[PDB]
Amino acid sequence: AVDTAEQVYISSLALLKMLKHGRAGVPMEVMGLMLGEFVDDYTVRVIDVFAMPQSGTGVSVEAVDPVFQAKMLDMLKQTGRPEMVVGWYHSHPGFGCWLSGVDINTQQSFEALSERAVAVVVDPIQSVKGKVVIDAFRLINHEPRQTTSNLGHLNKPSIQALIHGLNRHYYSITINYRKNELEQKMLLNLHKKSWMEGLTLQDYSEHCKHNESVVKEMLELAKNYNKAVEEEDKMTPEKQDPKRHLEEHVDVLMTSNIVQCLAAMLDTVVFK
């Protein structure tokens, strides 16, 4: 029947594969496929993603080598992944997530292939500093889709794909990440602090330099804090400078000194 607000769950492995391949491809656009299950009409699951060789034709249907795709699928079936392929992702470095004119036609072919295949656009150079610019698109054939729920407008579109047709020729589908408790705190081991890192005593000369600088900054802040309190007269009732800056300085200084003293003490008494 006619589709709806829908959803697309992509796995952690899939997302990292996509981001890594995109950051490998920049500045040349690169593309590949995701494996997944059409679990139902209201959401599509993709798990695992495999990139495919970058031909000189650029991101297009011709860039999809049938031999490479077929034998990759066969070997993944042997290795334990019988997941049948819906979805193709491509990279748009330097510009937002939207389907270009080429992308419209590639997704038209992909839709003709299965029916509900989903396009994915990743910008590997804008997806940085903790923000990931990922988005997923489907083409329309009056009424664009059925809005039978409120989980279609929990997100907001963007002007870039708006002119490029985020509702005009294609529509964006809300993206969700199906992480589980096992992948959780498996990834976390990457920033996980080690016990020796916990008992590490920093550096005493560097700590003294830090206290030296921060107390001097405290003095220079208090100098104008005095002026601020001496202009308490309430001419033209007006968060810059003295008060909250002094607050953050005292907070960081006090916590650093307390933690250094505590680590030093614990090391003194426990280590012999």
Binding site: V26, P124, I125
Partner: protein, 187 residues
């Protein structure tokens, strides 16, 4: 060198050659010897004392304390052999020689000539013992169109940057020395 994704620094390269400067160094000056040039024994002796001896034999200069002359300019009637003399000096000294017609250094791009001459002197400092030769210097050394004066200022500044240790020397050749700005003529 910078990545084109996060712009971080990797593989910091030594320095650029500015391939023009590559051409003005690895250009054949001929097999001319001091024998092939005749009639200028006084001038040949002076030039070899000013440009060859400070280069090949510096210890005399540093111990004695003499600041070696930075460069010497050649003037005279056309066809007297100034360019030939420079060619002989280039050919006989086993060194790194730089020769470029002044007219060619001027470029139609904004401030390209100043960067050109800056990179030439940087290459000369990089590739000591280096020798740079100027022919028809009056193309840019003339009396005070705008870019000519702007690049002449860069010439004065850069060759004022010659530190005493450097084994680099200057030869300018011209046919009308009067047109030269007195700025260079100063000690």
């Amino acid at each position: 060198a910078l990545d084109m994704t996060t712009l971080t620094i990797m593989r910091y390269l030594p320095r650029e050659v500015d391939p023009l400067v590559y051409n003005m160094s690895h250009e054949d000056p001929g097999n001319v010897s001091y024998s092939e040039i005749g009639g200028l024994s006084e001038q040949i002796r002076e030039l070899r004392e000013v440009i060859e001896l400070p280069l090949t034999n510096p210890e005399l200069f540093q111990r004695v304390g003499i600041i070696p002359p930075k460069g010497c300019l050649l003037y005279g009637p056309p066809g007297t052999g100034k360019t030939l003399l420079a060619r002989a000096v280039a050919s006989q000294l086993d060194c790194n020689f730089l020769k470029v017609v002044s007219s060619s250094i001027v470029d139609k791009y904004i401030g390209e000539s100043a960067r050109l001459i800056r990179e030439m002197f940087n290459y000369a400092r990089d590739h000591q013992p280096c020798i740079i030769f100027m022919d028809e210097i009056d193309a840019i050394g003339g009396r005070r169109d705008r870019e000519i004066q702007r690049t002449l200022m860069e010439l004065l500044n850069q060759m004022d940057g010659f530190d005493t240790l450097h084994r680099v020397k200057m030869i300018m050749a011209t046919n009308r020395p009067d047109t030269l700005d007195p700025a260079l003529l100063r000690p």
